[PDB]
Amino acid sequence: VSQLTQFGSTLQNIIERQDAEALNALLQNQAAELILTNLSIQDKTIEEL
Amino acid sequence: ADKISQSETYRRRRQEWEIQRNNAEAELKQIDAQLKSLAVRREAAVLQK
Structure with a gap:
């Protein structure tokens, strides 16, 4: 026992x-899936500038 | 001579309307690009959502 x-x-x-x-x-x-949207946001900030 | 000075007055006034019309056209033109920038900023805000 x-x-x-x-x-x-x-x-x-x-x-x-x-x-x-x-x-x-x-x-x-x-977090690997969460990173892609941040990349898209940064890219569209460039177009804003 | 007073008729001539009246004629030169009306001509100078018309040139000042070129200064004003061109200034208004430039401000109108810059507003459209401001709207384009805000359209981007809003696309990036939908993406943040």
């Missing part, structure tokens, strides 16, 4: 880590 509890603690640590890394990859793909 104590061996099982040790596998259960390793399993909880794995679950927490993998979920945080899926959030880390989500925020990067989301």
Whole structure:
């Protein structure tokens, strides 16, 4: 049983880590998508000048 | 001589109407480009939205 509890603690640590890394990859793909509109805004500011 | 001086007066007045008409035309022409710039600035504001 104590061996099982040790596998259960390793399993909880794995679950927490993998979920945080899926959030880390989500925020990067989301900022990669957010950058394009800023580029378009800067380009149209040039046409304004 | 007074008839001649009247004639030169009417001519000088007409030249001053060239100064005024050209000034008005230039201000009218610059307003259209101001509108073009504001049209850009608004396209960039829709894009910010």
